[PDB]
Amino acid sequence: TTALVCDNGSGLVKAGFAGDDAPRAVFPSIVGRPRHQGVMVGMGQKDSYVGDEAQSKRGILTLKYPIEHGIITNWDDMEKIWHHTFYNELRVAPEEHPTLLTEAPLNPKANREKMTQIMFETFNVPAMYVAIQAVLSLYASGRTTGIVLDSGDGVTHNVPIYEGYALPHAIMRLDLAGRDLTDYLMKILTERGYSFVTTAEREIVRDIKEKLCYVALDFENEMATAASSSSLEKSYELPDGQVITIGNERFRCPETLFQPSFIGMESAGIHETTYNSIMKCDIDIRKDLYANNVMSGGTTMYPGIADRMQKEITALAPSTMKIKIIAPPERKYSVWIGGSILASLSTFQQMWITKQEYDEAGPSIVHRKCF
Amino acid sequence: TTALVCDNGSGLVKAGFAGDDAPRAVFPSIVGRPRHQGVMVGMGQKDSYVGDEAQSKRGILTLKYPIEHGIITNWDDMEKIWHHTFYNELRVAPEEHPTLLTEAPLNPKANREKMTQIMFETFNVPAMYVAIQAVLSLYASGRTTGIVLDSGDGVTHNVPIYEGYALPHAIMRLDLAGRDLTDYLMKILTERGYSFVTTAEREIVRDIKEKLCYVALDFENEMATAASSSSLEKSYELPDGQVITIGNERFRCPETLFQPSFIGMESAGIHETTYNSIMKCDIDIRKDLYANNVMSGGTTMYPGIADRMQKEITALAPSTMKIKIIAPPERKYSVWIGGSILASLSTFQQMWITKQEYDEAGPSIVHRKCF
Amino acid sequence: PFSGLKFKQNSFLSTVPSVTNMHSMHFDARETFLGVIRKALEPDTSTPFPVRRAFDGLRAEILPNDTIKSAALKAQCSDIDKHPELKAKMETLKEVITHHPQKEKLAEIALQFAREAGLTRLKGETDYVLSNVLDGLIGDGSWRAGPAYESYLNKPGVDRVITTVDGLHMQR
Amino acid sequence: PFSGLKFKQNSFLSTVPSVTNMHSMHFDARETFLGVIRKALEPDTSTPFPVRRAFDGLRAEILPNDTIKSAALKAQCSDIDKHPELKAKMETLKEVITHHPQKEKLAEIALQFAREAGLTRLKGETDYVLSNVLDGLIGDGSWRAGPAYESYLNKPGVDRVITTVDGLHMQR
Ligand SMILES: Nc1ncnc2c1ncn2[C@@H]1O[C@H](COP(=O)(O)OP(=O)(O)O)[C@@H](O)[C@H]1O
Ligand SMILES: Nc1ncnc2c1ncn2[C@@H]1O[C@H](COP(=O)(O)OP(=O)(O)O)[C@@H](O)[C@H]1O
Ligand SMILES: [Mg+2]
Ligand SMILES: [Mg+2]
């Protein structure tokens, strides 16, 4: 039987089959409900919209994300999305297909326990297994050593792994990701008179961020250049035909990744988080981890992010060490590819959690067999 | 020299001298122009009317508000408003007085830039300063800790301050204020056959709302009572001698503040906005922010609003916290009182934006010496 | 029986629909309302796992998510007396609602559906599933009377008013 | 003159203030920046004792911590000719700042202080100590022209974009 590697993220649901190279279905993880009163007989009959439909009809819907900060908070919507991604997108019958899921480190135990309970009771899957997102991202990169900085819509976590060993005491997490960047962009776009308050307008701002933002090599040099001429200004087209123009806001929005104090967070920037993470590893390992920085995730797709991260870490790292950022072109789908590789290995077949084991111990069993 | 305080709010304009207890001039912020063709020569007609003069002759004028949702749309009208405020109500010479201004938080920066430029060129003021209305509101109440909910004619915003330190990332802003309530009442009054469409009749609806509306402690309980008997009915006399009677419209019109979805807005009610703003601050300052709610502005003069706010916040907050809502009887002029207090403090005299500074820096100086 | 159960402070607020949709042509008042109470009744992690597992089974048989599950509950509940098992299973759910810390907030939500959407249209002959939930929220049993409505037919204060626009066009 | 002097790697990172507090109404940017500079210049243990003591004395006499000492020093920094031999120690200190391995990071910190807090306000009439520190950090003297701020009055890319909320309450 073929495994269904299904990655659930804060922003996007990446699903597919084991052994493939690319996911087959990628739709945003949103659920939409109407907010205006219908008047036409027939027509509107659905109480909820999921996936691309909720994205297409966003003019008349309120969109809620079931996942925030990588922790599921609305379980009914999550169950709805799981049903959709199995019966209407991959065209499969979960009863005859083992499934693989993903979860960020340092999550509440109840989240994973519930997830196991839902998977074995509302879907009757043959087997399941929850793997750390950063760990899977390393399988796709074809390495056994290196530190992984997986940042997407929910969290930005670092997990160093050396020679098939993960040092858990150096795992760090930060609830600063794409959604926080979108909120900051919405906050600063009001400096130019553009107001976005509704959920659909939040999606529009998110699209602007994806299509116009970039990370500056020198924040100061860039702000000075933007304030000297109009070279950095660009124009974006709203869906109703109005045109907006953004100047320094293009690179101030992703600067929050390097200066979390912009959004009022006391925590350090990602470069300093990575530097602290390696320094908690044993002194004999730091050299290999300096030279295998592997990035993966939607927030890791801002153009120029690799150069800024390399510059900052080299500023922090010792002079004699070599710093090498690895940013593969498919780092948006690194986690899914790594999951497909893991589910397709022969030795991994002894690590599934089957229904017989589930019934004996209960969801709890998931802590024992999964890292 | 004597300082001038000018609170150019969306609906009314408050002006006076620093060190006073009350404003000296308060007139509506409306500019009116004739809409009928004149036939009698000799009396003479001005092309426009400003302030109370435009109110008296409103039967032959179209009244245009120069300020909409807190942002100055028409600048020529605002220039005429300031001309009036300086030469016909306070009877002063602008060049011989430092003037202070107010601005709603999170407004476009072009607004304050043009304000500074206009005051430093057209009127040649020796010194000026732009303050945030919530901060002045907190000065007026003699407190240094608390969360300010200033709800005027165009903007309703929250600004939490602790020990003289503000938290900008927790500041909320909602474009739901008195003018939207007036529009909603104008729409609802058509249910009883009363139709008001002209700009002059908008003012009459505003007076009805001022003199006959109140916020119900229990909305569903109040609606049932007004549907059962005629206790809540009251009658208002139109300027032409006709009499109208309004029933449950009295407490439905202000309910938009707590249920914005009535007028098609997706935002949450002002109680929920206050709770969200409090919750975004540090955990160690929530106890003090719960117990120092300060309301100010015209929209907070509906009878019974304080009790409804206390009930809603207590329903939202944990049980062991103490909720105290502060509603001073002179809260309609809290912003101006605070402005008068700030201009009369010795330590503040070093913070003026002198003409020299503006000349050297340019209208951009407003973004440095002002918050 | 279900001691040690705690709930989130305010989590059902994200389930109530807009007042507008509450006037929509095919708005399901019963199904959505049972959704609001169910999201409120979701146990918090602070509950011990043995206690939490017990309540989740109770919510899985009386307030489900799938449409067919609620449809089957609506069918066999007409002559509910033939199933004594559900009568006790429904009562133990009612006593939990009465002690909910946010009962006052949930009481208002029920009345908002009744007046705007029409949740209490049957005013005494409901599904007996919606009955106990309302009975748990407000114990006075006054929702069966129906929501009082204001009638504009009588017009004690009828005031024919000729405003600006109405004065350009009249008769007699 | 200080052959063998060494420092730590990121000892000064814990002193850089938050950007939010950097806009405080009563923020004294000069004291914070000099404190950052001093903390970056603290010698390490591996430095030989005589050199370490000499450099500690130099830092103490040129960059003190007491507010009264800093004010007294700034009083006589207006005229350096009336106090000879002060430039020699000042030049000796300014020499070692350029050889700091963290020159780039320190220069970026100074640039951030300029734009956010307003470190270079006099931009040509600043005090001797701060000007010399800035000259040591950046050798081109480009901090005297100002942070090159931006004016949102050029009106270049505004469209009065009517969004969802702005569509409701609008005139003409
Ligand atoms: N090319 C891009 N540039 C900038 N941001 C992007 C890009 N592509 C995706 N994103 C952002 O990354 C976020 C999450 O992407 P992803 O890594 O798939 O999240 P998850 O890991 O939760 O699935 C989205 O919110 C999206 O806005
Ligand atoms: N007694 C009252 N009851 C209800 N509303 C009032 C009352 N007094 C004033 N208002 C409202 O306050 C608004 C203006 O108050 P104010 O805060 O001074 O506006 P601004 O801040 O724009 O000057 C008016 O639009 C009016 O509707
Ligand atoms: Mg991810
Ligand atoms: Mg005001």
Side-chain angles (χ1 to χ4, degrees), chain C residues 66-108:
Chain C
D66 200 358
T67 301
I68 61 171
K69 296 261 185 94
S70 67
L73 200 63
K74 193 180 167 102
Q76 73 178 0
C77 197
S78 45
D79 209 7
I80 195 60
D81 291 331
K82 79 169 79 71
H83 279 107
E85 183 178 1
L86 193 143
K87 303 291 289 294
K89 280 228 179 180
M90 181 95 97
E91 151 56 10
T92 179
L93 188 153
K94 183 213 159 150
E95 41 186 60
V96 176
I97 302 171
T98 61
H99 308 329
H100 200 287
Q102 293 295 109
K103 161 168 91 210
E104 269 305 316
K105 282 300 271 176
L106 278 173
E108 161 56 21

Coordinates of all heavy atoms in Angstrom, one line a residue, chain C residues 66-108:
Chain C
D66 N -20.9 16.0 12.0 CA -21.4 15.5 10.8 C -23.0 15.7 10.7 O -23.7 15.6 11.7 CB -21.1 14.0 10.5 CG -21.2 13.6 9.1 OD1 -21.5 14.5 8.3 OD2 -20.9 12.4 8.8
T67 N -23.4 16.0 9.5 CA -24.8 16.3 9.3 C -25.7 15.0 9.5 O -26.8 15.1 10.0 CB -25.1 16.8 7.9 OG1 -24.3 18.1 7.7 CG2 -26.5 17.1 7.6
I68 N -25.2 13.9 9.0 CA -26.0 12.6 9.2 C -26.1 12.3 10.6 O -27.2 11.7 11.0 CB -25.3 11.5 8.3 CG1 -23.9 11.2 8.8 CG2 -25.3 11.8 6.9 CD1 -23.3 9.9 8.2
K69 N -25.1 12.5 11.4 CA -25.2 12.2 12.9 C -26.3 13.0 13.5 O -27.1 12.5 14.3 CB -23.9 12.4 13.6 CG -22.8 11.5 13.1 CD -22.6 10.3 14.0 CE -21.4 9.5 13.6 NZ -20.2 9.9 14.3
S70 N -26.4 14.3 13.2 CA -27.5 15.2 13.8 C -28.8 14.8 13.2 O -29.8 14.9 13.9 CB -27.2 16.6 13.5 OG -27.2 17.0 12.1
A71 N -28.8 14.4 11.9 CA -30.1 14.0 11.3 C -30.7 12.7 11.9 O -31.9 12.7 12.2 CB -29.9 13.8 9.8
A72 N -29.8 11.8 12.2 CA -30.3 10.6 12.9 C -30.7 10.8 14.3 O -31.6 10.2 14.8 CB -29.2 9.5 12.9
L73 N -30.1 11.8 15.0 CA -30.5 12.2 16.3 C -31.9 12.8 16.3 O -32.7 12.7 17.2 CB -29.5 13.1 17.0 CG -29.5 13.2 18.5 CD1 -29.3 11.8 19.1 CD2 -28.6 14.2 19.0
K74 N -32.1 13.6 15.2 CA -33.4 14.3 15.1 C -34.6 13.3 14.8 O -35.7 13.6 15.2 CB -33.4 15.4 14.0 CG -34.5 16.3 14.0 CD -34.4 17.3 12.9 CE -35.7 18.1 12.6 NZ -35.6 19.5 13.2
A75 N -34.2 12.2 14.3 CA -35.3 11.2 13.9 C -35.8 10.4 15.1 O -37.0 10.3 15.3 CB -34.8 10.3 12.8
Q76 N -34.9 9.8 15.8 CA -35.2 8.9 16.9 C -35.6 9.7 18.2 O -36.1 9.1 19.1 CB -34.1 8.0 17.3 CG -32.9 8.6 18.0 CD -31.8 7.6 18.3 OE1 -32.0 6.4 18.1 NE2 -30.8 8.1 18.9
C77 N -35.5 11.0 18.2 CA -35.8 11.8 19.3 C -37.2 12.3 19.4 O -37.6 12.8 20.5 CB -34.9 13.1 19.4 SG -34.8 13.9 21.0
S78 N -38.0 12.0 18.4 CA -39.4 12.4 18.4 C -40.2 11.6 19.5 O -40.8 12.2 20.4 CB -40.1 12.2 17.1 OG -39.7 10.9 16.5
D79 N -40.1 10.3 19.5 CA -40.6 9.5 20.6 C -39.4 9.1 21.5 O -39.0 7.9 21.6 CB -41.3 8.3 20.1 CG -42.4 7.8 21.1 OD1 -42.7 8.5 22.1 OD2 -43.0 6.8 20.8
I80 N -38.8 10.1 22.1 CA -37.6 9.9 22.9 C -37.7 8.9 24.1 O -36.8 8.3 24.6 CB -37.0 11.2 23.3 CG1 -35.5 11.1 23.8 CG2 -37.8 11.8 24.4 CD1 -34.6 10.5 22.7
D81 N -39.0 8.8 24.6 CA -39.2 8.0 25.8 C -38.9 6.6 25.6 O -38.7 5.8 26.6 CB -40.7 8.2 26.3 CG -40.9 9.6 26.8 OD1 -40.0 10.2 27.3 OD2 -42.1 10.1 26.7
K82 N -38.9 6.1 24.3 CA -38.6 4.7 24.1 C -37.1 4.4 24.3 O -36.7 3.2 24.3 CB -39.0 4.3 22.7 CG -38.0 4.8 21.6 CD -38.3 4.1 20.3 CE -39.5 4.8 19.6 NZ -39.1 6.2 19.1
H83 N -36.2 5.4 24.5 CA -34.8 5.2 24.7 C -34.4 5.8 26.0 O -34.0 7.0 26.1 CB -34.0 5.8 23.5 CG -33.9 5.0 22.3 ND1 -34.6 5.2 21.1 CD2 -33.2 3.8 22.0 CE1 -34.4 4.3 20.2 NE2 -33.5 3.4 20.8
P84 N -34.5 5.1 27.1 CA -34.2 5.6 28.4 C -32.7 5.9 28.5 O -32.3 6.7 29.4 CB -34.6 4.5 29.4 CG -35.6 3.7 28.6 CD -35.1 3.7 27.2
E85 N -31.8 5.3 27.7 CA -30.4 5.6 27.8 C -30.1 7.0 27.5 O -29.3 7.7 28.2 CB -29.6 4.6 26.9 CG -28.1 4.8 26.9 CD -27.4 3.8 26.0 OE1 -28.1 3.1 25.3 OE2 -26.2 3.8 26.0
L86 N -30.7 7.6 26.4 CA -30.4 8.9 26.0 C -31.0 9.9 27.0 O -30.4 11.0 27.2 CB -31.0 9.2 24.6 CG -30.5 10.5 23.9 CD1 -30.4 10.2 22.4 CD2 -31.5 11.6 24.2
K87 N -32.0 9.6 27.7 CA -32.6 10.5 28.7 C -31.7 10.9 29.8 O -31.5 12.0 30.2 CB -33.9 9.9 29.3 CG -35.0 9.6 28.2 CD -35.6 10.8 27.6 CE -36.4 11.6 28.6 NZ -37.7 10.8 28.9
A88 N -30.9 9.9 30.3 CA -29.9 10.1 31.3 C -28.7 10.8 30.7 O -28.1 11.7 31.3 CB -29.6 8.8 32.1
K89 N -28.3 10.3 29.5 CA -27.2 10.9 28.8 C -27.4 12.4 28.5 O -26.5 13.1 28.4 CB -26.8 10.1 27.5 CG -26.1 8.8 27.8 CD -24.9 8.7 26.8 CE -24.1 7.5 27.1 NZ -22.9 7.4 26.1
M90 N -28.7 12.7 28.2 CA -29.0 14.1 27.9 C -29.0 15.0 29.2 O -28.6 16.1 29.2 CB -30.3 14.2 27.2 CG -30.7 15.6 26.8 SD -30.2 16.0 25.1 CE -31.7 15.7 24.2
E91 N -29.5 14.4 30.3 CA -29.6 15.2 31.5 C -28.2 15.5 32.1 O -28.0 16.6 32.5 CB -30.4 14.3 32.6 CG -30.0 14.6 34.0 CD -30.1 16.0 34.5 OE1 -30.6 16.9 33.7 OE2 -29.7 16.3 35.6
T92 N -27.2 14.5 32.0 CA -25.9 14.8 32.5 C -25.2 15.9 31.7 O -24.2 16.5 32.2 CB -25.1 13.5 32.5 OG1 -23.7 13.8 33.0 CG2 -25.0 12.9 31.2
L93 N -25.7 16.1 30.5 CA -25.2 17.2 29.7 C -25.8 18.5 30.1 O -25.1 19.6 30.0 CB -25.4 16.9 28.2 CG -24.8 17.8 27.1 CD1 -24.6 17.1 25.8 CD2 -25.7 19.0 26.8
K94 N -27.0 18.5 30.6 CA -27.7 19.7 31.0 C -27.1 20.3 32.2 O -26.9 21.5 32.3 CB -29.2 19.4 31.2 CG -30.0 20.7 31.5 CD -31.2 20.3 32.5 CE -31.6 21.5 33.2 NZ -33.1 21.5 33.6
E95 N -26.8 19.4 33.2 CA -26.2 19.9 34.5 C -24.9 20.6 34.3 O -24.5 21.4 35.1 CB -26.2 18.8 35.5 CG -25.7 17.5 34.9 CD -25.8 16.4 36.0 OE1 -26.9 16.1 36.4 OE2 -24.7 15.8 36.3
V96 N -24.1 20.2 33.2 CA -22.8 20.8 33.0 C -23.0 22.2 32.5 O -22.3 23.1 32.8 CB -22.0 19.9 32.0 CG1 -20.7 20.6 31.6 CG2 -21.7 18.6 32.6
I97 N -24.0 22.4 31.6 CA -24.3 23.8 31.1 C -24.7 24.7 32.2 O -24.3 25.9 32.2 CB -25.4 23.7 30.0 CG1 -25.0 22.8 28.9 CG2 -25.7 25.1 29.5 CD1 -26.1 22.5 27.9
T98 N -25.5 24.3 33.2 CA -25.9 25.1 34.2 C -24.8 25.7 35.0 O -24.9 26.8 35.6 CB -26.9 24.4 35.1 OG1 -26.2 23.3 35.7 CG2 -28.1 23.9 34.3
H99 N -23.7 25.0 35.1 CA -22.5 25.5 35.9 C -21.4 26.1 35.1 O -20.3 26.3 35.6 CB -22.0 24.3 36.7 CG -23.0 23.6 37.6 ND1 -24.1 24.2 38.1 CD2 -23.1 22.3 38.0 CE1 -24.9 23.4 38.8 NE2 -24.3 22.2 38.7
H100 N -21.7 26.3 33.8 CA -20.7 26.9 32.9 C -20.4 28.3 33.4 O -21.3 29.1 33.7 CB -21.2 26.9 31.5 CG -20.1 27.1 30.5 ND1 -19.4 28.3 30.3 CD2 -19.6 26.2 29.6 CE1 -18.5 28.1 29.3 NE2 -18.6 26.8 28.9
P101 N -19.1 28.6 33.5 CA -18.7 30.0 34.0 C -19.2 31.1 33.1 O -19.5 32.2 33.6 CB -17.2 30.0 34.1 CG -16.8 28.8 33.2 CD -17.9 27.8 33.3
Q102 N -19.3 30.9 31.8 CA -19.8 31.9 30.9 C -21.3 31.6 30.5 O -21.7 31.9 29.4 CB -19.0 31.9 29.6 CG -17.5 32.3 29.8 CD -17.4 33.8 30.2 OE1 -17.1 34.1 31.3 NE2 -17.7 34.7 29.2
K103 N -22.1 31.2 31.5 CA -23.5 30.9 31.2 C -24.2 32.2 30.8 O -25.1 32.1 29.9 CB -24.1 30.2 32.4 CG -25.6 30.3 32.4 CD -26.2 29.4 33.5 CE -26.4 30.1 34.8 NZ -26.3 29.2 35.9
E104 N -23.9 33.3 31.5 CA -24.6 34.5 31.2 C -24.3 35.0 29.7 O -25.2 35.4 29.1 CB -24.1 35.6 32.2 CG -25.0 35.7 33.4 CD -26.5 35.9 33.1 OE1 -26.8 36.7 32.2 OE2 -27.3 35.2 33.7
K105 N -23.1 34.9 29.3 CA -22.8 35.2 27.9 C -23.5 34.2 26.9 O -24.0 34.7 25.9 CB -21.3 35.2 27.7 CG -20.5 36.4 28.2 CD -21.0 37.7 27.5 CE -20.3 38.0 26.2 NZ -20.8 39.2 25.5
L106 N -23.5 33.0 27.3 CA -24.2 32.0 26.4 C -25.7 32.2 26.4 O -26.4 31.9 25.4 CB -23.9 30.6 26.8 CG -22.6 30.0 26.3 CD1 -22.3 28.6 26.9 CD2 -22.6 29.9 24.8
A107 N -26.3 32.7 27.5 CA -27.7 33.0 27.6 C -28.1 34.1 26.6 O -29.1 34.0 25.9 CB -28.1 33.4 29.0
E108 N -27.2 35.1 26.5 CA -27.5 36.2 25.5 C -27.4 35.7 24.1 O -28.2 36.1 23.3 CB -26.5 37.4 25.8 CG -26.3 38.4 24.6 CD -27.6 39.0 24.2 OE1 -28.6 39.0 24.9 OE2 -27.7 39.5 23.0

